[PDB]
Amino acid sequence: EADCGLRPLFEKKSLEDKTERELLESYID
Amino acid sequence: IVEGSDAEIGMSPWQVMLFRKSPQELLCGASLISDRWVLTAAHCLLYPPWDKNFTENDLLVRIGKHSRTRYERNIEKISMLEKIYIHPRYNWRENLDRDIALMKLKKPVAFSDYIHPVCLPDRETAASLLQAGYKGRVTGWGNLKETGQPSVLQVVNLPIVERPVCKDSTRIRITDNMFCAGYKPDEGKRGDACEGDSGGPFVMKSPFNNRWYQMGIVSWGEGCDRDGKYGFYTHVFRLKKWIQKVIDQF
Amino acid sequence: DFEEIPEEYLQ
Ligand SMILES: *[C@@H]1O[C@H](CO)[C@@H](O)[C@H](O)[C@H]1NC(C)=O
Ligand SMILES: Cc1ccc(CN)cc1
Ligand code: NA
Ligand code: NA
Numbered sequence A: 001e002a003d004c005g006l007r008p009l010f011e012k013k014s015l016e017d018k019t020e021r022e023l024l025e026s027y028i029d
Numbered sequence B: 001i002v003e004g005s006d007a008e009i010g011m012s013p014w015q016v017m018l019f020r021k022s023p024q025e026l027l028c029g030a031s032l033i034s035d036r037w038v039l040t041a042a043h044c045l046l047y048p049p050w051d052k053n054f055t056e057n058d059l060l061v062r063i064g065k066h067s068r069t070r071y072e073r074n075i076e077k078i079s080m081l082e083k084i085y086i087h088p089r090y091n092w093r094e095n096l097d098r099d100i101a102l103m104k105l106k107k108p109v110a111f112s113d114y115i116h117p118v119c120l121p122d123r124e125t126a127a128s129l130l131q132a133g134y135k136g137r138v139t140g141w142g143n144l145k146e147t148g149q150p151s152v153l154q155v156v157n158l159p160i161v162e163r164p165v166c167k168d169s170t171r172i173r174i175t176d177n178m179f180c181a182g183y184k185p186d187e188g189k190r191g192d193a194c195e196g197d198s199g200g201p202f203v204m205k206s207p208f209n210n211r212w213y214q215m216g217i218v219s220w221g222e223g224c225d226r227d228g229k230y231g232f233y234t235h236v237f238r239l240k241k242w243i244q245k246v247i248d249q250f
Numbered sequence C: 001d002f003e004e005i006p007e008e009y010l011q
Helices: A020-026 B123-129 B163-168 B237-249
Strands: B015-020 B025-032 B037-040 B059-063 B077-086 B101-105 B135-140 B154-159 B178-181 B201-205 B212-220 B231-235
Touching: A020 B135, A020 B154, A020 B201, B015 B037, B025 B059, B025 B212, B037 B212, B101 B237, B123 B212, B123 B237, B135 B212, B163 B178, B178 B212, B231 B237
Parallel strands: none
Antiparallel strands: B015 B025, B015 B059, B025 B037, B037 B101, B059 B077, B077 B101, B135 B154, B135 B201, B178 B231, B201 B212, B212 B231
């Protein structure tokens, strides 16, 4: 779907879940 | 999930529970990829060594859930299966190569705050993100330890492991249709999927477009959270041509 | 111990 992967309670409201930053910090490139 | 934590509400709105009708029980995880299509592991539906060969009418899928055991009135949706499709080269005899299956729902599920599809990766997203050290996220209602069961959906973030380390951890033949993830003994963090989590998603949040992509399917592990062992995941991008063929045809 | 689901989904 064009809207895939954007969570109504997080990305769609610009709210961050409690551990997604751990993922971002591992993406070292 | 071993050494995970309780999910936040709506944290994994593509999570699906594969549910046996009789006896009523959790069979596996799965994921929502569109309003009519659910992705899971083939071995959740077909595994002859254990006399497992489910038909459509044996099963339901439950979408939008958080609690493992409760009927989440006004939140979850329960869908019947129209048709199961198993990869024609799924290798149940040897090593679970190509451990992937699709389920088409009888009717579309309505999206909500709790129900929303995950993306499937393109080649470029897969090439950028499927790298040793990069972390993904595994979710499920499976057991909390190898040898107990959670009240609510569990979540754990785990790093992808270098392919030689994956291969050197096991006597099973590892293929290009698998990747492995988990911490090494020296790394001082732990975590894994466990029984009941298979078929669920390994997801990564693209830093390029801020969308979640399903890179893996929880496939197999020797025990759960054992030192020196890793969890193995179906490589979704490598099998995407089959996914596309099924959805285009049916 | 799973809570019973509505009978409509089992018919
Ligand atoms: C699984 O069961 C179906 C019957 O619904 C049968 O057609 C199929 O050949 C079986 N496959 C295996 C590997 O036993
Ligand atoms: C990835 C994974 C890890 C552990 C199990 C349970 N043996 C299944 C799947
Ligand atoms: Na080996
Ligand atoms: Na391990």
